[PDB]
Design a protein around this nucleic acid. Structure first.
Ligand code: K
Ligand code: K
Ligand code: K
Ligand code: K
Ligand code: K
Ligand code: K
Ligand code: K
Ligand code: K
Ligand code: K
Ligand code: K
Ligand code: K
Ligand code: K
Ligand code: K
Ligand code: K
Ligand code: K
Ligand code: K
Ligand code: K
Ligand code: K
Ligand code: K
Ligand code: K
Ligand code: K
Ligand code: K
Ligand code: K
Ligand code: K
Ligand code: K
Ligand code: MG
Ligand code: MG
Ligand code: MG
Ligand code: MG
Ligand code: MG
Ligand code: MG
Ligand code: MG
Ligand code: MG
Ligand code: MG
Ligand code: MG
Ligand code: MG
Ligand code: MG
Ligand code: MG
Ligand code: MG
Ligand code: MG
Ligand code: MG
Ligand code: MG
Ligand code: MG
Ligand code: MG
Ligand code: MG
Ligand code: MG
Ligand code: MG
Ligand code: MG
Ligand code: MG
Ligand code: MG
Ligand code: MG
Ligand code: MG
Ligand code: MG
Ligand code: MG
Ligand code: MG
Ligand code: MG
Ligand code: MG
Ligand code: MG
Ligand code: MG
Ligand code: MG
Ligand code: MG
Ligand code: MG
Ligand code: MG
Ligand code: MG
Ligand code: MG
Ligand code: MG
Ligand code: MG
Ligand code: MG
Ligand code: MG
Lengths: 123, 129
RNA sequence: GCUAGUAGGUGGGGUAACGGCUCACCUAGGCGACGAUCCCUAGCUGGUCUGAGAGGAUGACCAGCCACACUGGAACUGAGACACGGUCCAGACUCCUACGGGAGGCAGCAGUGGGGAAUAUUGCACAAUGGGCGCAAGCCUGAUGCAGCCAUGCCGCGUGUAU
RNA sequence: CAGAAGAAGCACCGGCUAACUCCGUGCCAGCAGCCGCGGUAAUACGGAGGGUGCAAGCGUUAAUCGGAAUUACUGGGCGUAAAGCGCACGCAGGCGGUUUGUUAAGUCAGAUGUGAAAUCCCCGGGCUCAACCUGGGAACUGCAUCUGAUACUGGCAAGCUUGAGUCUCGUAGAGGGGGGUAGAAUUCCAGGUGUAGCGGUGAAAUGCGUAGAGAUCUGGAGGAAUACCGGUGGCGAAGGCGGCCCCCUGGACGAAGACUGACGCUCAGGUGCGAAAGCGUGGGGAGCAAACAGGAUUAGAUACCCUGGUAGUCCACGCCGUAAACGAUGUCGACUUGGAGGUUGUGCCGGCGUGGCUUCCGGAGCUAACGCGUUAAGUCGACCGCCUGGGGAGUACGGCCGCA
RNA sequence: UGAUUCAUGACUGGGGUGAAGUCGUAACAAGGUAACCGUAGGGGAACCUGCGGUUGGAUC
């Protein structure tokens, strides 16, 4: 583009959309589980992945992953969600924070405990 | 149409050097002559002469060193579509000072080194390396 | 496409002051693709973050400017206000009442409830700096100086040394 | 004073990325920023031992810039990857050959005022050090005013002729608009001769024929298109233009001069032209032929094949405004080795030059490659149009235009 | 009485994703009728046919 053309119409920056719009630029958000269930991933993976539908304090209704082995979550549980897509799960853009509010930490976890809300064992 | 006779002068030099021409010829002008003078004093061209009265013709004798063109690169800077003026403290350095910038100052056309010594800025005509 | 006090002029009025500031009359103008009008968002700057730079993003603390003071409107007093802890009217809320009628405004400091992923003590003192009043002594000062709470950040140190 | 006495965690270890083994599990449970890992020998899941990185912190999430030259001013692209408007004319705008003088707006130099302090940076000073505090400078890249400089750009004045244009003479051309006409052929109509087939296909059948077809001869009617010439030939801005003749009319080129004196180039918006199909009104209708019908083929055959056949194709006027409207290559100008041709001028003595347009090859250079290569996709300048991952989508909604 | 904006609405239009069931085989080789572009008509569907255009067609 010539400078004459740029004087009339300057260069335009592309605005980027957030991959986590339901957080509304907050680091976490609290919600109430409306449904807890399992789902199967995309090809080429196979599993029964644990997710939940969670209505957030700002009115958004989204799906959130429940990481770790085993959980204590059911309908009406109050949880805290954070950013983080689950690659092989269609349209799951958020992770549940283990060890916050009504979500319990994972039992018997010994490594990466802080990622799953597990207190230090007394050994 | 023709709208930059200076860029045409530089291109004739650039293309003539690439074609291993001994000399290039072009319609003359006082500004072209003033630029030819700087090219000669810096040893980039060998000589020049203006021939003719009502339609003067400028001829530049090109030089080659060891079978290679002496002008390694010659480039228009200020141009009709976008003029470039520099103050004395911001005159450009071509090839870390190994090349020249032809500057038009109020004391005439000279190199960037000469314009720095006279404490003048001006219009950056071209880089020569 | 927009505009009739609209654009300009004359005269009167008005203001501390110039002015369509206002009124009467005359002219028919004025603004706009160098984006008017309309719509959405937004306090502005010194700066701050990033970047080799050019830029991009941003405007918390600190300092300058502006605007606001429960919501809408108004003036009075005064050198200065259309006035955060003044006045008047209207409105929504809370409260008192003998039912006629009255009272109030934390976006000052601390604090409570609420909302939220999330942000502190209903502390001490006018000793210092500064401000109001006073001839002064002094009185007032949640400005300010300090203390309490929180790994929130930056910086320093320790959690032993030698064998 | 007393005694090591009170004081270490968090993430990670397949690759990017510093750090590897065993056991458990067996596309399960699970991990994940991405590539991906998990199917019975998992350095990728989970535990352990060992290791790596940070450390009173360490991880995760959110958010900004960076990397991203991935909006490219610095600093990118558009033949085929996304991208040149279908082609023009042209207002605003951008740009402007050459000489002299003048002006001093841009530009340049210097001065003065201002650019708050803090912050950043430099040299220091003070807290045991550092953070922090602080002195002095620099910086604040700007704005205004004054005084100078005059090369370049702009303004004003005067020129100049090389860009652009006018005139004179001629040349080639399917350039355009209007009218006329000719010959060949198809179809139809009439008549003569003549008799059992014709037509069609891969093979058939539908169809036509003893009510006399097909074939052959004569006469007539009518519409559409112009064999040969004909050519990687010509003309035109593009779309496009093909018998012959006349009338009206545009452009290009060449040779010698004369004339004007920068009158130029490009162009958002605007306006005009714009294949075929299609639309409106009125005509026309031979041949061809969407739709449609029948016969075949086939598993089916809403097709390809056959026999028919209506819009339409043709004319007048108006609309539509799109095409792989293509060289998938915007316009203008300058410059840079060669070879062989076509076509159309002109100079000179078949021979030698010199112009215009055009086809193929190929050098340097350029390009991701293919290729382009003096008709550039090479080397430069002026201006415009356009691109920014694939799909959704050139779609929806709104506007404008249109009879649709 | 208008404008604009947000929410919502029986029903309806196409789109994306997943999954692969039913129907065919349009494209890629000359893809078995060269493909594609504009337009028009037709058809369960991919598509077919007419008219002009392109080579980004194989063979010759
Ligand atoms: K898998
Ligand atoms: K007024
Ligand atoms: K007046
Ligand atoms: K800024
Ligand atoms: K208010
Ligand atoms: K106050
Ligand atoms: K005090
Ligand atoms: K095993
Ligand atoms: K650029
Ligand atoms: K003619
Ligand atoms: K245009
Ligand atoms: K037919
Ligand atoms: K079949
Ligand atoms: K017909
Ligand atoms: K049309
Ligand atoms: K073509
Ligand atoms: K020739
Ligand atoms: K000749
Ligand atoms: K253009
Ligand atoms: K119609
Ligand atoms: K609605
Ligand atoms: K086909
Ligand atoms: K094909
Ligand atoms: K078609
Ligand atoms: K059907
Ligand atoms: Mg005024
Ligand atoms: Mg007045
Ligand atoms: Mg606001
Ligand atoms: Mg950078
Ligand atoms: Mg008063
Ligand atoms: Mg007050
Ligand atoms: Mg108050
Ligand atoms: Mg408070
Ligand atoms: Mg709460
Ligand atoms: Mg008091
Ligand atoms: Mg490694
Ligand atoms: Mg194993
Ligand atoms: Mg592991
Ligand atoms: Mg960038
Ligand atoms: Mg690119
Ligand atoms: Mg393509
Ligand atoms: Mg393309
Ligand atoms: Mg084109
Ligand atoms: Mg033009
Ligand atoms: Mg000039
Ligand atoms: Mg000046
Ligand atoms: Mg300062
Ligand atoms: Mg020191
Ligand atoms: Mg300092
Ligand atoms: Mg001048
Ligand atoms: Mg001048
Ligand atoms: Mg037609
Ligand atoms: Mg129709
Ligand atoms: Mg018609
Ligand atoms: Mg008709
Ligand atoms: Mg047929
Ligand atoms: Mg098009
Ligand atoms: Mg064509
Ligand atoms: Mg062609
Ligand atoms: Mg195109
Ligand atoms: Mg070639
Ligand atoms: Mg290229
Ligand atoms: Mg459309
Ligand atoms: Mg129209
Ligand atoms: Mg097929
Ligand atoms: Mg086919
Ligand atoms: Mg289309
Ligand atoms: Mg059909
Ligand atoms: Mg057919």
């Amino acid at each position: 583009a010539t400078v004459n053309q740029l004087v009339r119409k300057p260069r335009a920056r592309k605005v980027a959309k957030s991959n986590v719009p339901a957080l509304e630029a907050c680091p976490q958000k609290r919600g109430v589980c409306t449904r807890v269930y399992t789902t199967t991933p995309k090809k080429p993976n196979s599993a029964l992945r644990k997710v939940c539908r969670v209505r957030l304090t700002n009115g958004f209704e989204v799906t959130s992953y429940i990481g770790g082995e085993g959980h204590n979550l059911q309908e009406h549980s109050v949880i805290l969600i954070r950013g983080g897509r689950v690659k092989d799960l269609p349209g799951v853009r958020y992770h549940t924070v283990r060890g916050a509010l009504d979500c319990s930490g994972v039992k018997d976890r010994k490594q990466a405990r802080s990622k799953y809300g597990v207190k230090r064992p007394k050994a | 149409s023709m709208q930059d006779p200076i860029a045409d002068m530089l291109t004739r030099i650039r293309n003539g050097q690439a074609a291993n021409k001994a000399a290039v010829t072009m319609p003359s002008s006082k500004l072209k002559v003033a630029i030819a003078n700087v090219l000669k004093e810096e040893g980039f061209i060998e000589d020049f002469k203006v021939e003719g009265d009502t339609k003067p013709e400028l001829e530049l004798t090109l030089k080659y060193f060891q079978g290679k063109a002496v002008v390694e690169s010659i480039q228009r800077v200020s141009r009709p579509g976008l003029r470039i003026y520099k103050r004395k403290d911001e005159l450009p350095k071509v090839m870390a000072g190994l090349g020249i910038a032809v500057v038009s100052t109020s004391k005439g056309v000279m190199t960037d080194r000469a314009a720095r010594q006279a404490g003048l800025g001006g219009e950056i005509i071209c880089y020569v390396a």
